[PDB]
């Protein structure tokens, strides 16, 4: 039961329609920016490789800087265009969604107060008002821009690949389906991770809220019975969580292995074509990166369709309600997990190995490209390219294994800790007294949210923090050390933008993820609707609601522009990094202080190392909130009652 496609934008005026049109135009322009950048990257790589080959030939760089000024200009132009287009897209789609959602909220409350007493259906109506409109917002908001941007990226990358090298383009097309499928599964797992963590506990949460809602339990003395009833559903939730920690991690590890195996295959075939003289290494780079990023994006834009369908489903009931025409017309924390040190040891080892996978990839990639920036025997070049393709495949296998192992070990330790903490907290609460239960800071809702959230958040201050820190160290620290060994001037230059690249990764992950007052008036009106319709305060309550929506409306309209500008700037910084790094690299290669191999190594190990650091740190939970919840859990566990009933 969904509304029509062109019926969900019924509350969009001419300004919202213009916003949506210009937003999808800017989204297409923004999506068509990465394949163009890969084209420019391939041309620049060809320049560097030809200069290096000629220098190695005439042994016994005079135009390199002049040629690289032009490509720095191209990089900067694409970066400024991406800045403008991404800002326009994000801001315009956010504005259109916000205005339509404001109108929908107002109309929905107006119609809710307009219903009849026989109509007034439950709780249910309140949850509808606070959740279905958020569903519509998520569906008609930035996700449409995401879908159009990724469609543009896919089509532009494949067009660039087919116009640059159709043989390699077809070879990577043959694996594009599994790449898009893995990207879609990855995005779905990331989008439905917290909802499944709630679904796993939804069974035990009912037993908790029923027992805590408690004097009967204390009187009849069934504390042990209710404790075992809770512990059974806790076992079930722990089993479901362990199954998820297995499945999600093995799927994402398979995705990583597929990415690296695509690297291996595509580079093996591309080196074959280059050694045969048909392709150049820059052409291979352009084709490979364009087609691969397009195939990944076309699968990355799969949750947008699900969000749109959920928006249609959620808007169906709201539109039916608002179209109803009634008859009448009115150390201390880590010790908690100390028994899981066998899991933590394996987790830390696998996190070290997983973090070290990015510098290893930088080394292998730089070496396989530097094979073609120098002259050598054909057989030697072929053997080196084969060895580096096999090394790419080994990187993929190690990535799969260690990613799955780290994820599973840390998730199992977290599930064990969560079950244990929930059990001890429920036991200590059942051991407490009615004098403790009467304390209005110990409300039933507060206790249930302590059991549901705080116990599940303590693991964020131990396993999650440890894994994130270990991975980010083993990645970026080793990358920076190797970059200082190989090219210290380029490393010193790129260290100035390392924080901005990490912040760009964080902001982009938050952007893909999608991360009071008016609710009070609404719930009071819905609860006391009999008295409201008796005193005929429908219009006055509508007025109070509309005035309580004003500050959130203005905050949303401002946050639209703020997040648009910050996202656009963080995106354009990734484009400007190319220009800066490779201009300085052209200088250093022309002045014989470094080679293009080392330039590529420093680039891949520093810029993309920081990007991966940001992408990983986007998954780290709030450490302060985790420690506060751990303190809460610990005090409730160690609380001893006065009138002991145990």
């Amino acid at each position, epitope marked *: 039961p969904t509304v029509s496609v062109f019926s969900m934008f019924r509350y969009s005026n001419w300004l919202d329609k213009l916003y949506m049109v210009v937003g999808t135009l800017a989204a297409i322009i923004h999506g068509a920016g990465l394949p163009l950048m890969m084209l420019v990257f391939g041309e620049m790589t060809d320049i560097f490789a030809n200069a290096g080959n000629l220098e190695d030939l*005439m042994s016994n760089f005079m135009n390199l800087e002049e040629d690289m000024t032009r490509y720095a200009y191209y990089y900067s132009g694409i970066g400024a265009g991406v800045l403008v287009a991404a800002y326009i897209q994000v801001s315009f789609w956010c504005l259109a969604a916000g205005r339509q959602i404001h109108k929908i909220r107002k109309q929905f409350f107006h119609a809710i107060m307009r219903q009849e007493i026989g109509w007034f259906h439950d709780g249910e109506l309140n949850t509808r008002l606070t959740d279905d409109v958020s569903k519509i917002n998520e569906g008609i908001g930035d996700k449409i821009g995401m879908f159009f941007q990724s469609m543009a990226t896919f089509f532009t990358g494949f067009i660039v690949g087919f116009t640059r090298g159709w043989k390699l383009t077809l070879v990577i097309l043959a694996i594009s389906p599994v790449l898009g499928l893995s990207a879609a599964v990855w995005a779905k797992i990331l989008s439905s991770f917290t909802d499944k963590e709630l679904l796993a506990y939804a069974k035990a949460g009912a037993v908790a809220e029923e027992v805590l809602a408690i004097r009967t339990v204390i009187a009849f003395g069934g504390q042990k019975k209710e404790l075992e009833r809770y512990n059974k559903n806790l076992e079930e939730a722990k089993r479901i969580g362990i199954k998820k920690a297995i499945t999600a991690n093995i799927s994402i590890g398979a995705a990583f292995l597929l990415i690296y195996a695509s690297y291996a295959l595509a580079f093996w075939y591309g080196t074959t074509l280059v*050694l045969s003289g048909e392709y*150049s290494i820059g052409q291979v780079l352009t084709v490979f990166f364009s087609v691969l990023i397009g195939a990944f994006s076309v699968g990355q834009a799969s949750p947008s369709i699900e969000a749109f369908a959920n928006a249609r489903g959620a808007a169906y009931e709201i539109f039916k309600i608002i179209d109803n025409k009634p008859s009448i017309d009115s150390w201390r924390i880590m010790k908690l997990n100390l028994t899981e040190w066998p899991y933590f040891v394996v987790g830390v080892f696998c996190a070290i190995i997983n973090g070290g996978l990015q510098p290893a990839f930088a080394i292998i990639f730089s070496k396989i490209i530097g094979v073609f920036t120098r002259i050598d025997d054909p057989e030697t070049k072929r053997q080196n390219s084969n060895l580096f393709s096999l090394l790419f495949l080994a990187l993929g296998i190690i990535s799969f294994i260690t990613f799955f192992l780290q994820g599973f070990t840390f998730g199992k330790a977290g599930e064990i800790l969560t079950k244990r903490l929930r059990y001890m907290v429920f036991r200590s609460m059942l051991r407490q007294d009615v004098s403790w239960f009467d304390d209005p800071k110990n409300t039933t809702g507060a206790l249930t949210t302590r059991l549901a959230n705080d116990a599940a958040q303590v693991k964020g201050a131990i396993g999650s923090r440890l894994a994130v820190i270990t991975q980010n160290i083993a990645n970026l620290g080793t990358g920076i050390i190797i970059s200082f060994i190989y090219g210290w001037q380029l490393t010193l230059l790129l260290l100035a933008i390392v924080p901005i690249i990490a912040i760009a990764g964080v902001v982009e992950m938050k952007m893909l993820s999608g991360q009071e007052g008016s609710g009070k008036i609404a719930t009071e009106a819905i609860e006391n609707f009999r008295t409201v319709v008796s005193l005929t305060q429908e219009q006055k309550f509508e007025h109070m609601y509309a005035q309580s929506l004003q500050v959130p409306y203005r905050n949303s309209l401002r946050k639209a522009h703020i997040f648009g500008i910050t996202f656009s700037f963080t995106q354009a910084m990734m484009y400007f990094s190319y220009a800066g790094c490779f201009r300085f690299g052209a200088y250093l290669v022309a002045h014989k202080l470094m080679s293009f191999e080392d330039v590529l190594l420093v680039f891949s190990a520093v810029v993309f190392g920081a990007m991966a650091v940001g992408q990983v740190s986007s998954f780290a939970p709030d450490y302060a909130k985790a420690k506060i919840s751990a303190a809460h859990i610990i005090m409730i566990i160690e609380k001893t009652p006065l009138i002991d009933s145990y």
Partner: antibody
Amino acid sequence: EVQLQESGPELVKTGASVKISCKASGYSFSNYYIHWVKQSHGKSLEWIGFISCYNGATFYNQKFKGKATFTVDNSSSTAYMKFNSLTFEDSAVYYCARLPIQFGNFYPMDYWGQGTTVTVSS
Amino acid sequence: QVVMTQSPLSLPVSLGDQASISCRSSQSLLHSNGNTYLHWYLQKPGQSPKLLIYKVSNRFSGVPDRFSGSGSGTDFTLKISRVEAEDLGVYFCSQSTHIPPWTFGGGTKLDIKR
């Protein structure tokens, strides 16, 4: 089917200039150097120099530096060798060969042109 | 600046017989990477020189098994097992180890022995 088709025989006057061509077909033009070789009658072949078919960077034998100029037209995928102030000792057969940029001097001159006969006489 | 010397300027041969063309370099043609870059080309009148052998012994793609290459250091040899009618021409060697100056052999014309 790699082919390096050269221009026809040309009879020029002493002291003048002339430009011979080598049109490539059947392969990626911008991935090779075009080397020029000179063969006089009863003499072994002699390397004049090469040009990069990717950007146009040249290298000349120290004997021919100044009196020969290499150019490239990537649109038509042709290479040109131009003389300056020709003389009798310039009358010879000039060949064009291709060499992979990836393996310089570590790989033979796999394909050659059929040769251009240049007769210089006043 | 290796000076390549082709031992027989002219070599009279007969149909269905073995022919051997020698090449001597004024300097060792073995490279630091362990390879010797000596190539043998065949040139017919009015046609482009065709690559026969490269790196001493490796046969080019399409060349029949009639042609073989051997030797090392400063002494190399091209051998034709059964001189056919399509083998009469000028065979010249070429070194690629010591450049910029690519140098070639003097050539060896195959006359028909009567």
